[PDB]
């Protein structure tokens, strides 16, 4: 949908203008859930290999947690930018074509006659 918009650099992960957006908080509910998905992987890895699930290979478990939070942090930053761009383009379009998105005056319920449906 947004592939060919103006100024769209090719295969740019985090364009420069993304830096005007607030970063993901480090303890973001979304980043934290990545940390848990990493921890489970380390546990599943020990299970599949027949090792003590929690005691064994803590260096691996630490690096699974770090890898997923690290990647999730930068992936989250990109989705924020993509979502920011979507609104940016959506609203600037509303401005450039006002005749297509007319403001409407909605009558109050004093003036509306909603049909009544008895429940007998």
């Amino acid at each position: 949908m947004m592939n060919g918009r103006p100024g769209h650099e090719p295969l740019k992960f985090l364009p420069d203008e993304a830096r005007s957006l607030p970063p993901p908080k480090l303890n973001d509910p979304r980043l934290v859930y990545m940390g848990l998905l990493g921890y489970c992987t380390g546990l599943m890895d020990n299970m599949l290999r027949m090792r003590p699930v929690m005691r064994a290979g803590l260096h691996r478990q630490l690096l699974f947690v770090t890898s997923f939070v690290f990647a999730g942090y930068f992936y989250l930053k990109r989705q924020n930018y993509l979502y920011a761009v979507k609104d940016h383009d959506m609203f600037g379009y509303i401005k450039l074509h006002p005749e297509d998105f007319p403001e409407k005056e909605k009558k109050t319920y004093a003036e509306i006659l909603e049909p009544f449906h008895p429940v007998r």
Binding site: K106, P118, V119
Partner: protein, 170 residues
């Protein structure tokens, strides 16, 4: 205690005893012994309690709910103003359930005391019941389980129209 205007109660008119037999009324004896052995000790226990409740006197209040814009003053879709109009109506609708109960307490309280003259001496309470029932039926009947202000308004508008069409002919 209770407010005697919310709960009207004719004054009692007990005829003064006229004992023309030589025998002793066994009711009036166990009533004395009951007062000395049952009533008197209990009243001390209660007077003891109310002297504690006087030392720790605490207060609580009836909550005031100012009036918010009606549903009729709400633009369609504005859930911010519909929500408050809807909450108010639900409060109102609930106070009307309790008004009906009060009017029912009176009618029940009159039926008992008039006894064999209820068909005659319970007219005023039966008239308020018959009137406050017609109002209730004109506000809340047939709304359904998902009753709300907007349905209450729709029911009223459909009725104000069916009556305007009465005089539009007559």
């Amino acid at each position: 205690s209770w407010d005697k205007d919310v709960y009207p109660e004719p004054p009692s008119r007990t005829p003064a005893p006229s004992p023309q037999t030589s025998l002793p009324n066994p009711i009036t004896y166990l009533t004395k012994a009951y007062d000395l052995v049952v009533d008197w000790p209990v009243t001390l226990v209660r007077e003891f309690i109310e002297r504690q409740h006087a030392k720790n006197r605490t207060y609580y209040y009836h909550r005031q709910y100012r009036r918010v814009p009606d549903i009729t003053e709400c633009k369609e879709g504005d859930v911010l103003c519909i929500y408050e109009a809807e909450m108010q109506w639900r409060r109102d609708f609930k106070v009307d359930q309790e008004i009906m109960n009060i009017i029912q307490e009176r009618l029940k309280a009159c039926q008992q005391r008039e006894g064999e003259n209820y068909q005659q001496n319970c007219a005023k309470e039966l008239e308020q019941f018959t009137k406050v029932t017609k109002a209730y039926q004109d506000r809340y009947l047939d709304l359904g389980a998902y009753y709300s202000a907007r349905k209450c308004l729709a029911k009223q508008k459909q009725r104000m129209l069916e009556e305007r069409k009465a005089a539009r002919q007559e």
